[PDB]
């Protein structure tokens, strides 16, 4: 339940496969249009080890469908997102999440 | 029924006796042992009397026929008065000394505690049902202690005030149903203006001291204020006022109220309910013990937070109870938090409501994690 | 075990250093003497460089001590059910308590020099409200015994020493215009809670010494672990020393105020209560003698018990003398109607057969010579 | 809209300033799970940007700074703050290098004092914990109350402290210019929130040495030089700033104290090795001293025949030059201690001009200067200011108040201590928060690691010094006091801690003794602990005194009468929780009273022999309060105990009245069993209260009176009859179903053993005929039953092992001594 839109083209060839940690700067978004999370605010890259299910499956699948240097607009439906419970104190349940993810580097 | 009692019970208002002689002139003369003088409890305004079916009781002043309602002091128990003087008289009795022995002179008996103790008094509170005994025991000598003028003055208002609301409540439930329509009221008119004056007097009588005062002076005024509030609660004035708001609340709007009482009475309705909440806020303010009483009926005020006519006062009342009693926070459940947050959504950006939430978080320096999360969960994620 | 234990050099380093420090503090730190109370107050008692501004008001504007005392009175006046503990209050109250006394035939002309300076130091304290400060703290303790109230009285005696008349006057004036009830209520409660000699605790302690225990971290020979007999004895010593001082100088104004409180709503009679305490004492010391017929000799604990126990009676008797000399007729009548006579009888009978028992041997010449000055 | 417009839009300014307060309130007191959730609504960039915004309104400036501290710094600050009161030191060379004075050539007694906070601190302080706030992480599969607690949200601290240092320099230089437009609007709004941040970092320990040097330069440059630039201390700041200023000063005031403690430890390390070396050589020399000496060697080797505590005490016992006779130390060593004492007190400012030259006398001047400038109107500022002033004027006293928390440990187990300390952080963090299901599991594993830590057993004096037992006690005190009237929710942690405390008691006598000193404090809280099984405060109270002859003797009257008064209440009223659970009603509580009896059984019987003092006191309270005995043996109209037992047996045997009539709860109560168990413990209590036989044979006056009293209460026919009552017997049959009784709902041998102990201690065995008359009907069925049941099918059953203990502990020891 995720769909991806190209923003800033990168390589389009070196897709992220299992073995290398993905280093990304992203920027969360409420579906109504309320900014709640980012990585440039904290100024540091968010590096996550793929395949180990540390992040939500929608973001994981989106990251898998991306490519190096390709900025992309993600869309996590609640099923592939936090869903009927929501992240407590941040995101209410049953909301679609929009992500301005920019995979700057693989290692 | 008179009872002996020990401990913190008789530092309250229910232990105050007024010595009323039989002579209108010079009633403030000194006391003579063996001279007729009635006994009156200030809060009830009733008199000690030898009744026929229940022995020694208090009777209404309408039936204080001077026979069962007369008593005489003495220093011993031996069988023996002097004529009344229109002057100050000679000094006899001490305060804190000079043990006295009251005798119902008309019947000749003596007041004394009833010796037997049932199962209820096997382990419970030790209250001795004093009975007017024909000869009595030996150790029933009594001391006489002076209460301060302030609480003595205070006591009389409870007796005056309570009967006023007793009349008021009787008026309220009299027209509780039975819509007037366009005709005449239910029955006798209610002392609305006197009640309005009464409340305005009490609110000032309970005003907290101003901060500009010297420290010790402020502390002293707290000493009095704390004593006053507990006395009124121990006389059930809080139970009275809660009945007042309960009976007043059955009308949503003034015209709806007017349909059952009267148009002339309709104007005062918003005023009186504002006074009631203001009085209650003064009543609860600062006392942990008085404050604790809302744990049993916390839902009751929450049921009324939605009302519009007197909302600022009731919110102040809630602020006062939460800022003081931690256990009320331990009684808080999710429906409450949904009610306060609804207030913020319905009453604009009233900054006071935030202070209510801040009081919900921490109380007296202990975190309430069962509440803090509910505040965050129901408020923060929506971002609206 | 002492033949076959671990020699000290075979102990681990961390353990050895652990016992090293706790021994060292008891040997050098605790034993160390360092008086600084005078330089404390002499620093805090000066108005340093405020003459330049010269405001219109006379009001001597800077006063570090006076602010300190005011602050303590401020926290003393709060509407608080229980009275907590303040370590700074311990420190400062002790410091100002220690600062006043500061103490082969030596003559009168130089004696008056030391007393006149002692007054000066007491003046240096009581003129800054410390006199009242003690009073409120006694009112605030609600009759609950403790270290802080014990230090409070220790200060009160430190300023009342030598029978300061004007300090007594300030005391009286403060009570008279405040008309406080709880001060005497607390005094009554504190004196009622004072302990008396007991048999059960004494014999239990005797058996405990009979065991002659050892611990696991070495061994201590005849440790002086918690004493359950006359633990609060110095509290009872100085309580009556305080009352004696506040009635010193034949203050007929104050003695009658003790016997009856004119201003206050409820009057508490200190004199009769003091007698009742003496009665409890009399039974206690009596019964302790009523434990010593079969035993024809008195050991150490019995002697040390009587040594501290009788100093209470000596202090109380000195207190009653100060209540009665002058003389205060109203007090004299109160004692005439008191239980003092029966207490006197019990003391006489105890002194009667006791000093025979002490006269049977020279081992108790000490305790006998104290008993002599007791009666 | 621009936030800087809020300096004009006051009506919203108040509301938003309150909003920040609410953010602090919800994240207050280390609710780190919430604190992470806040980081969505307020972002690190927003906070860091808002720090330097000069035009920002005052209240919002202070609100935002405090909001930063609350979101990121309080939890680690408060935990570190608590750990500042302890001083655990390792036996490491970096500890050894620590010296009271830095090397120099200023003066013989005391060189120039070391700069506060500048240097090395080897004292134990656990690592900080932080988590990167990243909210796209998958929801952990661990449910509520089971996942480990979230750490503090992270934030760059080395960059933060650089920004804070630069901010301070900006404020310091700005203040001297006497500009009419202070940052934020007011001088207090300018200096105070920044000073709060600096103080928090100082507690955090983020600052390095050069950072500290600069901090000392900004506050007061010229005094703190080592060999408009005007410092804080003379810009006539308002009172509120002075509060933070005092906080800054006292933080440094702790540093010299911690320095002294470590320097003492370093001296202890070097000195003790010399002591053990010299004492060793003296031992070897003393063993060959026989060639020129005699029995005076007994005095010489008394030191070696004395425990080390007095050995070191006599080693140190040479201070006053009038006690050196027993000191064997050579004069060089004797000099070294006095030398270290001299410079130590010099570093305490005891013994040895407008230049302050040092921290102590500088701050003393500072405090006096402030006090004489004006009547200080902040009570907290006054209290803190005089707090400092006392701390400076009494260097030795504060050190003496610090040594009871000083401990030296070998470097081997430092990580073990770290493991312990992090649990200590958890328990200490739980004093200030109402208990919840998450926290309950936190405490359960917190003590779980403690019981697994060997240092918790290896250095028990340290554990007592930390007072962790006290800290646990406060937790239960709050749990019991919350809802003590009704019932105790979260009982699992309550009984876990009560198990822990009993373990703590068993470690050593001193640990038990210190635990004991709060005994009275337990008793009132134990008034409702009867509802929960497992371990209770009463159980802790019992193990607090078990087998301590000194302690049962010191067990105060008031404590005993308080317990029996409770037992009176249990013996006079039902159990409301059992009443609510469907159980039938009786006018007393067998379970609750039985628990009190078990306590008293440990309260009076010590190491196999009775204690007469406790025995006579307790029976004196039982006789004065005859309701303690229950409906039977009550007095007027009270049926006999003999009569009492049979229907209790029938009640347990016949259902619908033994229990609710609705184990299933794993501790389902059985009334008849409880009633008889109470009676059994009552008898066992009296039996252990009986006087010892050497006293009875000596015929001591009052001692005969007690035995007379007990014999008046308890008649022999009851003793023989119940001792001769039958027992349920396991049998083989019904497709081999070994019919075994339920020990929780059947008659047990132990209750008989209680009365056997009674008879032996009270009546005893005198004549042969009565002996046989007890043997045939009371004992002989037991031996024949046990001998028959001694089969491989049944000998391992619960009832068989019950008899094995019953016979070998009660019957056989009685028979053996009456064999003649």
Q: Kindly report the three-state secondary structure assignment for every residue of D150-191.
A: CCEECCCHHHHHHHHHHHHHHHHHHHHCCCCCCCCCCHHHHH
Q: Mark D510-542 as b/e (b = at least 16 C-beta within 10 Å).
A: ebbbbbbeebeebbebbbbbbbbbebbbbbbbb
**Opening angle at CA B349, ends B347 and B353, nearest 5:** 75
CA distances from C157 to C117, C325, D319, D342 (A): 17, 20, 35, 36
Q: Measure the CA angle with vertex D551, ends D545 and D554; round to 5°.
A: 130
* DSSP secondary structure of D475-488: HHHHHHHTTTTT--
Rg (chain B; Cα; Å): 26
Contacts of B219 in chain C (CB under 8 A): 77-79
Q: For the residues of B192-231, what is the DSSP string, one character each?
A: HHHHHHHHHHHHHHTPPPPTTS-HHHHHHHHHHHHHHHHH
Q: Pairing between strand A71-76 and A46-48?
A: unpaired
A22-25 vs A5-8, strand pairing mode: unpaired
Q: Of A4, A50, A56, A98, which residue is the catalytic one?
A: A56
User: Taking Cα atoms as reference points, which of C117, C277, C108, C248 lies closest to residue C187?
Assistant: C277
Handedness of CA B140, B146, B147, B152 (dihedral sign): positive
Rounded-to-integer distance, Cα B309 and Cα B306, Å:
10
| Cβ within 8 Å, pair B365-D432 | yes
CB A58 within 8 A of CB A97: yes
A56 touches chain D (CB under 8 A): yes
Are D12 and B358 in contact (CB < 8 Å)?
no
B146, B222, B226 ranked by CB distance to C265: nearest: B146
- Alpha-carbon distance of C200 to C284, in angstroms, equals 12
Question: Which of D227, D218, D219, D249 is closest to D112 using CA atoms?
Answer: D227
First to last CA, chain B: 62
Q: Give the closest residue to D499 by CA, choosing from D462, D532, D521.
A: D532
Task: Answer whether C13 touches D (CB < 8 Å).
Answer: yes
| C322 has binding-site annotation | yes
Where is B60: in which H helix or E strand?
Answer: strand B56-60
Cβ atoms within 10 Å of B313's Cβ, excluding its own: 18
Please note each residue after which chain D is broken, C-to-N distance over 2.5 A, or write none.
227, 352, 662
Token pair belonging to D114? 């070391």
* Contact between residue D482 and residue D503 where contact means Cβ atoms under 8 Å apart: no
Please answer yes or no on whether B365 and D569 come within 8 Å at the CB atom: no
Give the angle subtended at the CA of C219 by the CAs of C217 and C223, to the nearest 5°.
115
> What's the Rg (C-alpha) of chain A?
13
D667 CB-near residues (< 8 Å, 6+ apart): D533, D744
CA A101 to chain B, closest CA, distance in angstroms equals 22
Residue-level length of chain D: 820
DSSP-assigned states of every residue in D683-708: HHHHHHHSPPHHHHHHT-HHHHHHHH
Q: How far apart are CA D748 and CA D744, in angstroms?
A: 9
Q: Do B361 and D26 touch (CB under 8 A)?
A: yes
Give chain B's contact residues with D (Cβ, < 8 Å): 122-123, 330, 349, 351, 354-355, 357-358, 361-362, 365-370, 372-373, 375-376, 380, 383
Q: What is the largest CA-CA distance in chain C?
A: 83
Where does chain B break, by residue before each gap (C–N > 2.5 Å)? 80
Here the tokens at position B376 are 């965050």
Q: Are D520 and D559 in contact (CB under 8 A)?
A: yes
Q: At what angle do helices C130-140 and C165-178 cross, to 10 degrees?
A: 50
Residues D678, D594: Cα–Cα separation, whole Å: 5
d(CA D39, CA D35): 7
Contacts of B117 (CB under 8 A, 6+ apart): none
Which residue blocks in chain B are alpha helix, DSSP H?
120-123, 149-174, 192-205, 215-234, 237-248, 254-258, 263-266, 268-284, 288-291, 298-304, 312-322, 326-331, 334-346, 351-361, 369-379
Q: Which of D601, D619, D618, D773 is nearest to D688 (CA)?
A: D601
CB B47 within 8 A of CB B35: no
Name C272's Cβ contacts closer than 8 Å, sequence gap at least 6: C334, C338
Any idea which residue has 């003698």 for tokens?
C289
Q: Helix or strand or coil: residue A23?
A: strand
Nearest C-alpha in C relative to D342:
C28
Token pair of C324 as six digits: 């009665």
- Which structure tokens are listed for D360? 């102590």
Could you write out the DSSP letters of every residue in D291-321? GT--TTHHHHTTTTTS-HHHHHHHHHTTTTS
Task: Write out the DSSP string of D104-140.
Answer: -SS-SS--SPPPTT-S---S--PPP-EE---TTBPPP
> What is the DSSP secondary structure assignment for residue B310, as one 8-state letter?
T
Chain D hits for A46, CB-CB cut-off 8 Å, are 134, 136
Distance CA B382, CA D241 (A): 39
Residue C1: burial class (beta carbons within 10 Å; 0-12, 13-18, 19+): exposed
Pairs of CB atoms within 8 A across A/B:
18
A86 CB near a chain B CB, below 8 Å?
Answer: yes
Convert D218-249 to b/e letters by CB count within 10 Å (16 or more is b): bbbeebbeeeeeebbbeeebeebbbbbbbbbb
Where does B38-93 have alpha helices with state H?
none
Q: Beta strands D406-409 and D87-90: pairing type? A: parallel
Measured N-to-C along each axis, helices C37-44 and D359-373 cross at an angle, to the nearest 10 degrees, of 40
**C-beta separation of D175 from D186 below 8 A:** no
Task: List the beta bridge partners of residue D130.
Answer: D152
Task: Say if CB B132 and CB B110 are below 8 A apart.
Answer: yes
Under DSSP, the state recorded for C301 is: H
Q: Nearest Cβ partner of C79 from B145, B147, B223? A: B223
- Alpha-helical (H) ranges within C247-364 are 252-259, 270-289, 300-324, 329-336, 340-359
Two tokens, residue B359: 């009081």
Burial of B254 (C-beta count, 10 Å sphere; 0-12/13-18/19+): middle
Rounded CA separation D600/D563 (Å): 9
The Cβ-side half-sphere exposure at C348, using a 13 Å CA radius, reads 6
Q: Which residue has the tokens 């010297």?
A: B214
How far apart CA D762 and CA C271 sit, in angstroms, is 51
Q: Which of A26, A59, A91, A100 is catalytic?
A: A26
Residues composing chain B: 384
CB C78 to CB B219 under 8 A?
A: yes
Q: What is the DSSP letter of D5?
A: G
Contact between C50 and D370 (Cβ < 8 Å)? no
Q: What is the DSSP letter of D583?
A: P
- Tokens 């909210």 belong to residue: D135
Asked if D36 and D150 touch (Cβ cutoff 8 Å), the reply is yes
Contact B222, B213 (CB under 8 A): no
Tell if the CB–CB gap between B222 and C74 is shorter than 8 Å: no
Burial of residue D310 (number of CB atoms within 10 Å: 0-12, 13-18, 19+): middle
> Is A46 in Cβ contact with D135 (below 8 Å)?
no
Residues of D in contact with C218 (CB under 8 A): 307-310
Closest chain D CA to residue A36: D40
Which of the residues D23, D26, D136 would you substitute to probe the A interface, choosing the one with the greatest number of A C-beta atoms within 10 Å?
D136
Breaks (C-N over 2.5 A) in chain A follow: none
What is the C-alpha to C-alpha distance for residues B169 and D669, in angstroms, rounded to an integer? Answer: 51
Active site residue A56: yes
Cβ contact B381–A92 (<8 Å)? yes
The Cα–Cα gap between D704 and B378 comes to 74
Please list, in sequence order, all residues whose beta carbon lies within 8 angstroms of the beta carbon of residue D778, skipping any fewer than 6 positions away. D720, D723, D724
User: Would you call D97 helix, strand, or coil by DSSP?
Assistant: coil
Could you tell me the two tokens for C101?
Answer: 């006394």
Query: Quick check: D788 and D759 in contact, CB under 8 A?
Result: no
Nearest to A41 among D45, D137, D138 (CB): D45
Give D208's contacts (C-beta < 8 A, 6+ positions apart).
none
Q: Do the strands B37-41 and B46-50 form a parallel or antiparallel pair, or are they unpaired?
A: antiparallel
| Beta strands across the sheet bearing A22-25 | A5-8, A71-76, A97-106, A22-25, A46-48
Q: Whats the size of chain C, residue-wise?
A: 375
Contacts of D39 (CB under 8 A, 6+ apart): D71, D133, D135, D153
Angle, CA D354 vertex, CA D348 and CA D359 arms, to 5°: 30
Torsion, Cα of C250, C256, C261, C263 (10° steps): -80
Place of tokens 């209590």: D685
**Strand D605-606 and strand D609-610: pairing?**
antiparallel
Nearest to D514 by CA among D455, D456, D562, D469: D469
Write the residue in B96, B219, B223 that is nearest to C267 by C-beta: B96
Q: Which of C26, C92, C226 sits opposite D386 (nearest CB)?
A: C92
For D522-669, list the strands marked E by DSSP.
Answer: 605-606, 609-610
CB-based contact C21 D394, cutoff 8 Å: no
Q: How was this one solved?
A: cryo-EM
Identify whether C327 is preceded by a cis peptide bond (ω within 30 of 0). yes
- Nearest residue to D128 (alpha-carbon basis) of D149, D147, D154, D148: D154
A91 catalytically annotated:
no
Q: How far is CA D741 from the centre of its chain?
A: 42
Nearest-CB residue to C216 (from D283, D400, D508): D508
A50 catalytic residue (yes or no): no
C-alpha distances in Å from residue D503, one per residue of B115, D457, D500, D535: 52, 10, 5, 11
D window 543-572, beta carbon within 8 A of B: 568-569, 572
CA dist C295 to B368, C289, D261, D696, Å? Answer: 64, 10, 53, 21
DSSP D202-237: HHHT---HHHHHHHHHHH-TTTT-------GGGS--
**Contact between chains at C208 and D407 (C-beta distance less than 8 A):** no
Tell me if residue A59 is catalytic. Answer: no
Resolution in angstrom units: 4.0
Q: What is the dihedral of CA C144, C150, C156, C157, to 10 degrees?
A: 130
């Amino acid at each position: 339940g995720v769909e991806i839109e190209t923003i800033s083209p990168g390589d389009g060839r070196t897709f992220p496969k299992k073995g290398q940690t993905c280093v990304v700067h992203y920027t969360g978004m409420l579906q109504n249009g309320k900014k709640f999370d980012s990585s440039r605010d904290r100024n540091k890259p968010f590096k996550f080890r793929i395949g180990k299910q540390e992040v939500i499956k929608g973001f994981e699948e989106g990251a898998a469908q991306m490519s190096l240097g390709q900025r992309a607009k993600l869309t996590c439906t609640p099923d592939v997102a936090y869903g009927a419970t929501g992240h407590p104190g941040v995101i209410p349940p049953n909301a679609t999440l929009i992500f301005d993810v920019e995979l700057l580097n693989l290692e | 029924l008179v009872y002996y009692e020990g401990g913190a019970v008789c530092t309250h208002a229910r232990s105050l006796w007024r010595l009323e002689p039989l002579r209108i002139s010079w009633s403030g003369s000194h006391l003579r042992w063996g001279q007729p003088l009635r006994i009156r409890h200030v809060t009830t305004g009733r008199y000690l009397a030898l009744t026929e079916d229940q022995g020694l009781v208090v009777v209404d002043a309408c039936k204080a026929h001077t026979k069962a309602t007369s008593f005489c002091f003495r220093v011993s128990k031996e069988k023996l008065p002097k004529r009344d003087v229109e002057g100050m008289g000679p000094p006899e009795i001490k305060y804190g000394e000079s043990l006295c022995f009251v005798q119902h002179v008309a019947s000749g008996l003596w007041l004394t505690y009833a010796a037997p103790d049932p199962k209820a008094l096997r382990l419970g509170v030790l209250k001795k049902k004093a009975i007017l005994h024909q000869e009595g025991h030996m150790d029933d000598a009594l001391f006489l202690t002076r209460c301060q003028q302030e609480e003595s003055q205070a006591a009389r208002m409870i007796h005056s005030t309570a009967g006023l609301y007793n009349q008021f409540i009787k008026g309220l439930d009299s027209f509780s149903g039975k819509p007037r329509g366009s005709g005449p009221p239910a029955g006798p008119a209610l002392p609305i203006e006197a009640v309005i004056l009464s409340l305005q007097d009490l609110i000032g009588y309970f005003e907290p001291p101003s901060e500009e005062l010297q420290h010790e002076e402020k502390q002293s005024k707290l000493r009095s204020l704390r004593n006053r509030q507990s006395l009124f609660q121990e006389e059930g004035m809080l139970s009275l006022v809660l009945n007042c708001i309960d009976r007043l609340n059955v009308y949503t709007t003034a015209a709806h109220f007017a349909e059952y009482a009267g148009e002339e009475a309709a104007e005062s309705w918003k005023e009186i309910v504002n006074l009631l909440y203001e009085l209650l806020a003064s009543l609860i303010r600062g006392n942990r013990a008085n404050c604790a009483l809302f744990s049993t009926n916390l839902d009751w005020v929450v049921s009324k937070l939605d009302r519009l006519e007197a909302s600022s006062g009731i919110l102040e009342v809630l602020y006062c109870v939460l800022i003081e009693s931690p256990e009320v926070l331990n009684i808080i459940q999710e429906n409450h938090i949904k009610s306060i947050i609804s207030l913020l959504d319905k009453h604009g950006r009233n900054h006071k409501v935030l202070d209510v939430l801040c009081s919900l978080c921490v109380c007296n320096g202990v975190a309430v994690r069962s509440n803090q999360d509910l505040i965050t969960e129901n408020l923060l994620p929506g971002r609206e | 075990a002492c033949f076959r234990m671990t020699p000290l050099y075979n102990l681990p380093t961390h353990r050895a250093c652990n016992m090293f420090l706790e021994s060292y503090k008891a040997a050098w730190i605790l034993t160390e003497d360092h008086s600084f109370e005078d330089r404390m107050i002499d620093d805090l008692s000066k108005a340093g460089e405020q003459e330049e501004e010269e405001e219109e008001v006379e009001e001597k504007k800077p006063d570090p001590l006076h602010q300190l005392v005011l602050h303590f009175s401020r926290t003393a006046l709060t509407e608080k059910s229980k009275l907590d503990e303040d370590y700074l209050y311990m420190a400062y109250a002790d410091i100002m308590a220690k600062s006043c006394h500061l103490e082969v035939e030596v003559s009168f002309e130089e004696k008056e020099m030391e007393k006149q300076r002692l007054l000066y130091q007491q003046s240096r304290l009581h003129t800054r409200g410390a006199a009242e400060m003690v009073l409120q703290m006694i009112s605030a303790c609600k009759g609950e015994t403790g270290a802080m109230v014990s230090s409070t009285l220790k200060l009160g005696i430190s300023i009342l020493n030598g029978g300061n008349a004007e300090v007594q006057q300030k005391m009286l004036d403060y009570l008279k215009d405040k008309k406080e009830v709880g001060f005497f209520q607390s005094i009554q409660a504190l004196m009622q809670t004072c302990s008396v000699l007991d048999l059960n605790a004494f014999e239990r302690q005797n058996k405990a010494e009979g065991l002659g225990m050892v611990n696991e971290d070495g061994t201590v020979i005849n440790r002086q672990n918690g004493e359950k007999v006359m633990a609060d004895d110095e509290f009872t010593q100085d309580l009556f020393r305080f009352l004696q001082l506040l009635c010193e100088g034949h203050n007929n104004d104050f003695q009658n105020y003790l016997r009856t409180q004119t201003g206050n709503t409820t009057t508490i009679n200190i004199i009769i209560c003091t007698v009742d305490y003496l009665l409890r004492l009399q039974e206690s010391i009596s019964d302790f003698y009523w434990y010593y017929s079969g035993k024809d000799v008195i050991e150490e604990q019995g002697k040390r018990n009587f040594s501290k126990a009788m100093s209470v009676a000596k202090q109380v008797f000195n207190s009653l003398t100060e209540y009665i000399q002058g003389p205060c007729t109203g007090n004299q009548q109160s004692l005439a109607h008191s239980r003092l006579w029966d207490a006197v009888v019990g003391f006489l009978h105890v002194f009667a057969h006791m000093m025979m028992k002490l006269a049977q041997d020279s081992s108790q010449i000490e305790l006998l010579k104290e008993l002599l000055d007791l009666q | 809209m621009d936030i800087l417009e809020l300096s004009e839009r006051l009506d919203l300014q108040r509301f938003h300033s309150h909003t920040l307060r609410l953010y602090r309130a919800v994240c207050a007191l280390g609710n780190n799970r919430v604190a992470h959730a806040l980081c969505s609504h307020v972002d690190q960039a927003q906070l860091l940007h808002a720090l330097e915004d000069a035009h920002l309104p005052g209240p919002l400036r202070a609100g935002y700074y405090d909001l930063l501290i609350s979101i990121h710094l309080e939890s680690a600050c408060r935990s570190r703050r608590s750990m500042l009161s302890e001083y655990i030191v390792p036996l490491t060379p970096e500890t050894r290098a620590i010296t009271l004075f830095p090397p120099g050539r200023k003066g013989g007694n005391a060189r120039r004092h070391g700069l506060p906070g500048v240097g090395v601190t080897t004292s134990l302080r656990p690592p900080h914990h932080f988590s990167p706030p990243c909210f796209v992480a998958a929801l952990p599969a661990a449910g509520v109350a089971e996942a480990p607690a979230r750490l503090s949200p992270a934030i760059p601290l080395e960059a933060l402290r650089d920004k804070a240092l630069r901010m301070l320099g900006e404020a310091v230089r700005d203040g001297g210019q006497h500009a009419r437009d202070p940052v934020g609007g007011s001088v207090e709004f300018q200096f105070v929130p920044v000073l709060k941040l600096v103080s928090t970092l100082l507690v955090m320990g983020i600052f390095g040495d050069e950072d500290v040097k600069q901090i000392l330069k900004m506050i007061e440059p010229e005094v703190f030089t080592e060999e408009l630039e005007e410092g804080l201390l003379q810009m006539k700041l308002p009172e509120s700033v002075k509060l933070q200023m005092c906080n800054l000063l006292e933080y440094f005031c702790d540093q010299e104290l911690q320095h002294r403690v470590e320097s003492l430890a370093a001296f202890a390390e070097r000195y003790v090795d010399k002591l053990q070396a010299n004492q060793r050589s003296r031992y070897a020399l003393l063993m060959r001293a026989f060639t020129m000496s005699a029995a005076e060697t007994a005095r010489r080797t008394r030191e070696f025949r004395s425990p080390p505590q007095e050995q070191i005490n006599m080693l140190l016992h040479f201070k006053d030059e009038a006690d050196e006779e027993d000191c064997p130390l050579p004069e060089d060593i004797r000099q070294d201690l006095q030398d270290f004492h001299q410079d130590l007190l010099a570093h305490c400012g005891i013994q040895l001009e407008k230049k302050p030259q040092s921290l102590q006398e500088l701050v003393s001047h500072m405090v006096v200067r402030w006090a004489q400038e004006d009547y200080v109107q902040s009570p907290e500022l006054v209290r803190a200011m005089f707090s400092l002033l006392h701390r400076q004027y009494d260097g030795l006293g504060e050190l003496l108040r610090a040594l009871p928390r000083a401990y030296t440990i070998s470097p081997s187990s430092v990580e073990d201590t770290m493991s312990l300390l992090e649990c200590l952080g958890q328990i200490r963090s739980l004093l200030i928060v109402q208990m919840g299901p998450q926290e309950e599991n936190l405490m359960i594993q917190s003590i779980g690691n403690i019981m697994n830590n060997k240092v918790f057993y290896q250095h028990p004096n340290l554990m007592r010094a930390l007072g962790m037992h006290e800290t646990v006690m406060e937790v239960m005190v709050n749990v019991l006091g919350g809802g003590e009237t009704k019932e105790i929710r979260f009982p699992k942690m309550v009984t876990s801690c009560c198990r822990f405390l009993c373990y703590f008691c068993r470690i050593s006598r001193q640990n038990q003794r210190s635990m004991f000193d709060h005994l009275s404090y337990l008793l009132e809280n134990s008034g409702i602990g009867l509802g929960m099984q497992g371990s209770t405060p009463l159980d802790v109270a019992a193990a607090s005194v078990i087998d301590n002859n000194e302690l049962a003797l010191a067990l105060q009257e008031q404590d005993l009468e308080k317990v029996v008064s409770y037992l009176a209440g249990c013996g006079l009223q039902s159990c409301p929780m059992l009443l609510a659970k469907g159980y039938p009603d009786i006018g007393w509580n067998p379970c609750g009273g039985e628990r009190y009896l078990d306590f008293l059984r440990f309260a009076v019987f010590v190491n196999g022999e009775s204690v007469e003092e406790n025995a006579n006191v307790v029976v004196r309270l039982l006789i004065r309060k005859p309701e303690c005995f229950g409906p039977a043996l009550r007095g007027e109209g009270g049926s006999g105990l003999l009569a009492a037992i049979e229907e209790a047996i029938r009640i347990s045997e016949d259902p619908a009245r033994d229990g609710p009539g609705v184990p299933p709860e794993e501790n389902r109560v059985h009334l008849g069993h409880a009633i008889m168990s109470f009676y059994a413990a009552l008898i066992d209590l009296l039996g252990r209260c009986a006087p010892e036989m050497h006293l009875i044979q000596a015929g001591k006056g009052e001692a005969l009176r007690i035995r007379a009293i007990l014999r008046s209460l308890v008649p022999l026919d009851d003793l023989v009859g119940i001792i001769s009552l039958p027992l349920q017997i396991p049998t083989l049959g019904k497709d081999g179903a070994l019919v075994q009784p339920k020990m929780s709902a059947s008659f047990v041998p132990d209750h008989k053993a209680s009365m056997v102990l009674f008879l032996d201690r009270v009546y005893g065995i005198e004549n042969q005929d009565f002996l046989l008359h007890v043997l045939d009907v009371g004992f002989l069925p037991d031996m024949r039953a046990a001998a028959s049941l001694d089969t491989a099918t049944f000998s391992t059953t619960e009832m068989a092992l019950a008899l094995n203990r019953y016979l070998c502990l009660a019957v056989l020891p009685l028979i053996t001594k009456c064999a003649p």
